[PDB]
């Protein structure tokens, strides 16, 4: 056929070792750009004035960091939410001082990861699958949007986006607790239920299927050779697994329907992480965790502290120390 | 339905940003100050206070070397200093009388700040859109006393949540509509499994 | 999509046991160390550089300042048996806050 | 930076010793039968 038809046929081909697709034509260049800039910056970028106070923070390995302390540092508070591409800087030296790499990386990453999700829809369609793996992926994806884009928008600066680094991540978490009391927010609590529960049900399902593998091997070989890729029969006895778990708790607390079971495995962590993402995305607009500071009062009016008041003392320590040279006025309003 | 769900998700995200930043069709008289507004109002409040005490706020150097009250934006405009440097795009009727061609005007700051501007800045600084889910107004470490969460926070948070779930609903129904139109929304035909007719990847 | 995929269902489900179970076991070992205050608190090379060079700053040194605030501001009420009295002037605080 | 001078050989043997263990076992599996 014509060259455009052949090109379209290759792009959407189900026979490519890695599927490309139309989402892929955006995903591949954007993710390569973000990856290459990230790696180069992580190794070699000079210090970045994250808080706009001419106090540059060193993030790269060559400038004194190890793997745990290193980061790509968010762009300057003086930029705020302004779009700061390379061509807006007078020079690369200026671009680097002000944290230009961070914006390039997170914007290419967020676009590429959004296309990764669309690409999961697209291949499922080409293969004749049902379509909702991409909906499961929307939960981690929404969480990345929350910490790299929505929280900066609500606070008015990409300098408050999560840094691209291990210790920078912890910095973001501690400051977030000081300013939003996230631990006391029910959407973060649902998030914890989601990931604790996800890990629990992962171990549970793994242990139950492994416990009921049908004997197909000898004592001196891995039991994994008892399963052959593409065999039609199930490789474990779900009736035995349910017979075990239903007696562990009680019969009606156990799944006998594999489709119901696996739907539950999908839904529990996905919904929980959706609420995690929505916690960050709504604390982005300063609707914060529950505040019970001085909620308990005695007959005279003395404050009777609760554990919430002890949390408050810890939060205060974080608040008064963070960004120790950046505040001139008494209230931290963003 | 899936097309409309995508449209409504987009509109919800837009409305979230409208109520968070815009103070024209969401007048601050009715909705409270925006986040940027209240932060600018704090800087205005202590500029007024310290200048009344005798400070020359144009030449006051802060701890970092930047002006404690006034500094330049990255393109040179005179703007409020401190963390509110991020909010210099803010515009509001209580502040614009102090703005000249190059930004905030020192002569207007020295001579022309009216009592109603001091009042409005104090009001907005102390009704910043920060507060707890049980409606304790202020920063997260503030004690109980003030029953306040800004309408801007209620409207922004609610509509982000709804916009997000409507994006999820769009993906759900768009993917399902495609699968149903093509005839495999109920699963793979065992006797006609498409991958079994494809060449191996390796 | 991802480049690799499971092909053995028995391996897949063993891996689902292995990953969270091993993670919790590792976290338990760290807490046994913290029982003795045997922390991963510092990077000595970072502290030596920062002590001599007041322009050197990383996210690691920023988080220690947060920790110092947490300790000083929470300890008097969180550890009442110590009878801590920290005068206002000794409390660590940045500017204004 | 004043790093621990044993960190380099600690890291090198940490990688090399178990990696070569696995490579030895892999290659002698391929060469069987």
């Amino acid at each position: 056929a014509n060259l455009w038809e052949r090109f379209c046929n290759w792009v959407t081909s189900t026979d490519n070792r890695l599927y490309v697709g139309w989402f892929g034509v955006i995903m591949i260049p954007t993710l390569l750009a973000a990856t290459i800039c990230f790696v180069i910056a992580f190794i070699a970028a000079p210090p970045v004035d994250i808080d706009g106070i001419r106090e540059p923070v060193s993030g790269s390995l060559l400038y004194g960091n190890n793997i745990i302390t290193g980061a790509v540092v968010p762009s300057s508070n003086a930029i705020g939410l302004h779009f700061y591409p390379i061509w807006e800087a007078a020079s690369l030296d200026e671009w680097l001082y002000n944290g230009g790499p961070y914006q390039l990386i997170i914007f290419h990453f967020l676009l590429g990861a959004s296309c990764y999700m669309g690409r999961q829809w697209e291949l499922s369609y080409r293969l004749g699958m049902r379509p909702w793996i991409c909906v499961a992926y929307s939960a981690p994806l929404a969480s990345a949007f929350a910490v790299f884009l929505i929280y900066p928008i609500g606070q008015g600066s990409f300098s408050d986006g999560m840094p691209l680094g291990i210790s920078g991540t912890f910095n973001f978490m501690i400051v977030f607790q000081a300013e939003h009391n996230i631990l006391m927010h029910p959407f973060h609590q649902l998030g914890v239920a989601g990931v604790f529960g996800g890990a629990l049900f992962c171990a549970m399902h793994g242990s139950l299927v492994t416990s009921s593998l049908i004997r197909e091997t000898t004592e001196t070989e891995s039991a994994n050779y008892g399963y052959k890729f593409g065999q039609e029969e199930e490789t474990y006895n779900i009736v035995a697994a349910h017979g075990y778990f239903g007696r562990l708790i009680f019969q009606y607390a156990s799944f006998n329907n594999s489709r119901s079971l696996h739907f539950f495995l999908a839904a529990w962590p996905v919904v929980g992480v959706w609420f995690a993402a929505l916690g960050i995305s709504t604390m982005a607009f300063n609707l914060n965790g529950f505040n019970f500071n001085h909620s308990v009062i005695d007959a005279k009016g003395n404050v009777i502290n609760t554990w919430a008041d002890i949390i408050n003392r810890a939060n205060l320590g974080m608040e008064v120390m963070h960004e120790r040279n950046a505040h001139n006025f008494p209230l931290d309003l963003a | 339905l899936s097309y409309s769900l995508g449209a409504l998700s987009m509109m919800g995200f837009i409305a979230t940003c409208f109520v968070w930043f815009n103070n024209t069709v969401y007048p601050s008289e009715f909705y409270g100050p925006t986040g940027p507004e209240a932060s600018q109002a704090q800087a205005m409040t202590f500029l007024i206070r310290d200048q009344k005490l005798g400070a020359n706020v144009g030449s006051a150097q802060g701890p970092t070397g930047l002006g404690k009250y006034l500094m330049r934006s990255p393109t040179g405009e005179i703007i409020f200093g401190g963390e509110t440097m991020r909010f210099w795009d803010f515009r509001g009727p209580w502040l614009e009388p102090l703005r000249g061609p190059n930004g905030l005007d020192l002569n207007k700051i020295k001579n022309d700040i009216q009592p109603w501007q001091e009042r409005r800045a104090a009001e907005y600084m102390t009704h910043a859109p920060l507060g707890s889910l049980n409606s304790v107004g202020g920063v997260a470490t503030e004690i109980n006393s003030v029953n306040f969460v800004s309408p801007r926070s209620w409207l922004a948070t609610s509509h982000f949540v709804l916009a997000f779930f409507f994006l999820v609903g769009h993906l759900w129904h768009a993917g399902r509509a495609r699968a149903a139109a093509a005839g495999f929304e109920k699963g793979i035909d065992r006797e006609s499994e498409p991958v079994l007719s494809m060449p191996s990847l390796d | 999509i991802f480049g690799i995929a499971f092909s053995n269902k028995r391996w897949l489900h063993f891996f689902m046991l292995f990953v969270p179970v091993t993670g919790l076991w590792m976290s338990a070992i760290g807490v046994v160390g913290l029982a003795l205050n045997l922390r991963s608190y510092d990077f000595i090379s970072q502290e030596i550089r920062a002590a001599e060079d007041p322009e050197f700053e990383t996210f690691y040194t920023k988080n220690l300042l947060l920790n110092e605030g947490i300790r000083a501001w929470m300890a008097p009420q969180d550890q009442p048996h110590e009878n801590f009295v920290f005068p206002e002037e000794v409390l660590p605080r940045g500017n204004a806050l | 930076m004043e790093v621990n001078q044993l960190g380099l050989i600690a890291t090198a043997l940490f990688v090399l010793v178990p990696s070569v263990f696995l490579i030895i076992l892999y290659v002698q599996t391929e060469s069987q039968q």
């Binding site: 190890n66 890729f229 | - | - | 380099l8």
Partner: peptide, 30 residues
Amino acid sequence: METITYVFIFACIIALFFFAIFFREPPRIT
């Protein structure tokens, strides 16, 4: 030497990805 070590380990991991993907043991229906 630290930076070389960190970047070396990272480079080995990326090479491992390449082999794990393009030179995997091929899945075969038995």
